[model samples]
Target: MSVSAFNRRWAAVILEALTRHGVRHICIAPGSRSTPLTLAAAENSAFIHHTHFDERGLGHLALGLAKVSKQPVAVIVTSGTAVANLYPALIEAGLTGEKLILLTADRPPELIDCGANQAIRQPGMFASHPTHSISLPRPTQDIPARWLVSTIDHALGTLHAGGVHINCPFAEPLYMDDTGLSWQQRLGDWWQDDKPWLREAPRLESEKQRDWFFWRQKRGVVVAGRMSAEEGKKVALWAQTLGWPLIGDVLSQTGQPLPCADLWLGNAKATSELQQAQIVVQLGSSLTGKRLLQWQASCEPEEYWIVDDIEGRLDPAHHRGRRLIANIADWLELHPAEKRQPWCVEIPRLAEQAMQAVIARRDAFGEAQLAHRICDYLPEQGQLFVGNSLVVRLIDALSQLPAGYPVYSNRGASGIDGLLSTAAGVQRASGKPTLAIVGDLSALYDLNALALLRQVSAPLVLIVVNNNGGQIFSLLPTPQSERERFYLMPQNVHFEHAAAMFELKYHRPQNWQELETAFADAWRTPTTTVIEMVVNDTDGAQTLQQLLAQVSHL
Candidate 1:
């Protein structure tokens, strides 16, 4: 029942099945066992295949495409720890609903548990992290082609939420010349039919118009968290029509929507004025500000509602709110609100004061200043991908693009790794000039992603804020005695050599003017450039700490 061309045959089927399910992008990391998958993906014209050497970067690369496209993205990796490298992105997708399709190649059952070269319990490897998984048997004629395609269909059906792992075991002769064989008899008409074996029905659970329409008349605030730019625009318009304050998270792309909302919350006048709101309506999830979360958790207003298209209970605070699982656009259409008188003017005025005070003396070169000034240089229509920790927090607290500016981040798990890979994929999918802001530690974390940038033909400005080490650790309450040596882990390293190694155009800007000029040049070329900003390690942490404190007095 075993055939010499079984590996190729099965691989071809899997790739076609993915296409049948609308998979247009595939990010692959190479290995001997992954030969069939790589070859099959290349042979197909339907896929836009992306390759990276490190599986860690490769997985996040797929996550980036999924993030932008809002479609199922595929990732292929070989056995052993290579499959394990996707864990961070997997967990991120779990929380954020990226819809990853993991096709992991593994050794055949015969090669398992007997000191196999690259075999390690691949079945239960992901351990309940992914939404669903299916451990497929090695390619063979004993199993009909129908079973192969059907298994993929069933797995995809369960992918309403996060990633789905399809661990594929293959007995070698993993590669073979295309024999052009047909299994039409064993597979039915689906081979020529070219339709997905299973069609996911539209979930239209009808609901009557709101029981909470009273909130539109009362004083309210609209919060937009992580969502697409198009969605963010609608939410922004809703706020304007309702004449309520809109707190747009950095990822919301609702530019300057009550700018300095995070810092303004530190202001006594602003916080008390916002606390008077009678209702709150939050659209999207994963807001970047902790102050907002704390306020949302504590403020038990008369009415609170959260609406999102993503499939999950996204509320971390479990606030006393009505959680509506509906498409944001559809929900807005279903229950529209007429224009109301503007209520919260005091907060926005104080917010402007807080924003000015925060940037008062930050004219000199520092992270806080960079965070504010860099927004002006972001080319018209260019997108931003911010790294986690201090940089994203800075962007949240300070940076904002003009209205409708698309920004992306890995705010789900908020991990430092894969910032570069994910940003590269965002550009690859969007085909736009991109600005990626990351810390020195994050740059070092997934620096191998530089290899992935060699494929970049669009402008990708990678700004690495090199403050020597984990300056974010300085914000913690740990003792200074063990902070630098143990926690902060200052690795006084630079990225100039790393740029040279990848043949990327590199610049070390000594001043803010130089950065402005360098960035203006970097935004145009169809190439990836690394602009390294070397600040004192503690400069950003100490200055921001002072700035946050200074905000209250304003």
Candidate 2:
């Protein structure tokens, strides 16, 4: 059977371009408009197609791949609702500034606005992402190869900058024949000869943009949020050169190396831990905590300078900051701030000493030691997506991950509902390794995430810290009547049974040695392993209280 215009062969050209560009994997949702592309993609030996039934899941999975590999993974979908289904992942990708390529097929513009079957404004729908939206002209005999060449380059450039959107408009009968025996062409020079039409964004000048309040402020507080030691140090050195105070959390390493302005550590505590500054220069998001609200309500800055490549973020509680809508690198290059000395060096030094004391104190306790031991066994390069409840806080206390490791927790909303699913997405996307450090209660709620393992690219380990119930609530003031039965309801049934039901490799580590062996086994074996640490829920409360008392500084 001969394929018509806009069919399998044409898609093969596109697929070949993707393969030549080093795209290894693609995800597709079942659809009619995508049939040509799907078949072509499948025929290519280099491209591995991941079939996902749910568009939303596929979209997230696409993002997962991009996030880990830092490459733009294409999400091919049919026209209509299939395109609409990609909204959730699009929204988050924009927020996170992830590199994702969206290739959506639709009818020509004439057919689109005429109330045709499955047609909507698909081109500019993803306005929020760092995107270059284009509705490619319907395939024609006289179509200039320049636009096609330029489009691919622009798409790659936009993806390199962050996330991008590309929409292909196809005429009726998607199958086309572009193959012939004597059809010899200069394929090597198609995209290679075409120059990159994009350049770095123009500088945000002071004279042209003097009206903005952030420009006038002399004292800028550079807040180096959650970033690596290298990224944090770069910002700190830049800030020192500018004489700006560098503030950041211990997690970001701005607080450590213990020198320069108190700005390093105090930046994270602009409101309470430190005094408010005139202008706030923030770099690298994911500075999640209650401290933001505290800073907003109390030590609110006059001008909050948010520097990132992405857009559309409104801190409802703290609205004072002015977002520098540019790459953080660009902003740092253009503007340098003065370095302020560490404000409360004594406090953090004391806090660190006290924290060490608490950790040492926890070492004396059997259960706390047990928790720390289990945490020590987690994979080195694996992404840890900790849930709320006691899970996040406990990991904060017990976890000691190696340097330069990627740690992800949904501290954005701090919801416990999607722990397993989110971790699976990250695991598959990253391909490094993933460990979900969740409590018994959070696991029970988001147990549905475990079911998504089938859709994931690889096995995932879920370390369930079973202390019966919501042990965090036990820390808060609860009535004695509600405390035991209602507050801390124990899940007496073992998590191993659930692992068995789900056909997962499950185990129970009663002691530190057993936990070590389990983690070692999981790391070596390429399989999903569930390790449940059953602690005494009743005594768990008292032990947590003692631990809390020692490190009240956090």
Candidate 3:
């Protein structure tokens, strides 16, 4: 049967414009209002479509795809709550600067306010999250199709990052038979246009060469946080050239061989050495350690410069001397520097010593030991996605990843929701062996996201560090009563059953050797696997205090 001419024409033109602007993937959550889009996506061979039952997961799945692809992915959904379901992922995308294009179908103007089912004020529903929002008028022959093409062209060209919402209201006869091929005549030459209606030209600006010339002489420390692996490597090289200590967050993948520097913050020698830094150059956003942030706040460096490509003030402390809003790589390439004498050289060695002190206590089971052991056994070519709370912090404090392998986290908002789904998305995008280390609460928070695991083509090993509760809270100064009731809300839930329910191979590793063996086996497995690392509950605050004391004495 022939498709309705109006639906087919609009769908074809829209998909063609998207494809012209380099959108190859479309994520759709099924619904009748979105039939035009769904049909369009299905008919187009140029686009790869992913369908999901839940719009929330669908939003995050598109987010993961866009995050890895470094390109905008389209999300098609029906009106009403389906549009609302995308809010969480939209918030994440906005914060992380990932690009998404949302195509939401809504009722026509007459039906919108006059009590239409499954219709709300759909146009502005996304609030301020979307980088751009447009209420597309109902499709009609009276309006030229070129306007649709140009609008999308502008959106693609203007979007630096974040989502674009196009609220499309279609009239009834959402599907109408193409009476003849005559409507095709209206879209003249649009089918043959190889390029978008508009294109963004690259603009060049002078790098801060003079700024670097003066700063190169000062004692600086490179604080690398969440960034792409490629960016981390460049920053590491910059640190090595300037003889600065590189404190790399786990997500930064800074190839520096040392213990996580924040672990050594309490050490007198390390503190004294780090205080000598004349400048603090922090690259990227969301460094995982609170102590390090506090330490930076306390010392008050002569100059604290933050370099990031994204727009916004990343300085939560308001201690920034200068902010360079440019990609670190592009800026570094433009402004080259020379090697300088070492300053604070003792901190790296002190970090190594601190790691040793922690290792000395590794005989007992804990999250710290489990984190280190996993890093030790991590495949050389594997990608790691660390969850928030104590998990990313532990990895940052205890382990170091090889250079070039990707490490990721939902550090934009740093909430625990959708972690498993995000990791699954990363694995899906990269088609590589991915390891996700998440805390017990984080695993349970996104327990339902296990459904996404089925779509993963590569092995995704999920390591859940279950300590029965929010163990990180044990380190804070909370009264015992409040701690148990409010903070640690312990649910002695096991994920072995959850893993089984999800059709994933599950293993409970009791000791270091068993963990190693299980990890090796899971690494070789062609499917998703869950490895549960159970640790006895300990006073996290007390344990950290003792560890810090040991580091200081060492």
User: Judged by TM-score, which candidate is best?
Assistant: 1
- List the pairs of residues colliding in candidate 3: 4-176, 474-541, 475-541
lDDT string for model 2 (344-437, tens) is: 3444454454345446645432445544443365577566555566555443444333434466655534555555655666677667667767
lDDT of each: 0.82, 0.59, 0.78
Candidate 3 residues lying further than 4 Å off, grouped into runs, are: 1-4, 179-187, 201-206, 539-542, 552-554
> On a 0 to 1 TM-score scale, where does candidate 3 land against the true structure?
0.93
Better of 1 and 3 by TM-score: 1
Q: Pairing residues by index, what is the TM-score of model 1? A: 0.95
The candidates, ranked best first by TM-score, are: 1, 3, 2
Better model by lDDT, 1 or 2?
1
Q: What TM-score would every model get versus the actual structure?
A: 0.95, 0.69, 0.93
